[PDB]
Amino acid sequence: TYPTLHILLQFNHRGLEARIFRHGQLWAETHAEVVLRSKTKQISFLSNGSYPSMDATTPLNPWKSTYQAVLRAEPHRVTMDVYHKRIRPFRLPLVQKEWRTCEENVFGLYHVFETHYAGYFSDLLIHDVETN
């Protein structure tokens, strides 16, 4: 097996929304209080796992900025590649991260993601899945 998670990330004026997919099924959701309008600050947060100063929530000047994180648990490493909008063949990842660790399952693979963004995401709301 290879555990894989696809995480759709939306930055908006309300914060950062993570939707976690598993074989194309929405498996889990979480939210973070990460309010960042510019692409530069968003990608800096995505790379570093944190950002020092958040922007103001402005419901009259809203925004929507979307990224996709792809996590793979290869036999002797975990990788995370983050793509603008979604993984496509014409575009390359904005952020590349790698860890010398073995993960058994999607729950461990999510823990790696959550630990890179430590302190930000609330606990998972999880949904019924019908695998394959």
Residue numbers in the entry: 10 to 141
From the paper:
Cardioviruses present a highly unusual variation to conventional viral PRF in which the virally encoded 2A protein is required as an essential trans-activator.
The asymmetric unit (ASU) of the P6222 cell contains four copies of 2A related by non-crystallographic symmetry (NCS), and the structure was refined to 2.6 Å resolution. Unexpectedly, the four molecules are arranged as a pair of covalent ‘dimers’ with an intermolecular disulfide bond forming between surface-exposed cysteine residues (C111). This arrangement is likely an artefact of crystallisation, which took >30 days, possibly due to the gradual oxidation of C111 promoting formation of the crystalline lattice. 2A adopts a compact, globular fold of the form β3αβ3αβ. The most striking feature is a curved, seven-stranded anti-parallel beta sheet. The concave face of the beta sheet is supported by tight packing against the two alpha helices: together, this comprises the hydrophobic core of the fold. In contrast, the solvent-exposed convex face and surrounding loops are enriched with arginine, lysine and histidine residues, conferring a strong positive electrostatic surface potential at physiological pH. In addition to the N- and C- termini, the β2-loop-β3 region (residues 28–37) exists in multiple conformations that deviate by up to 5.8 Å in the position of the Cα backbone.
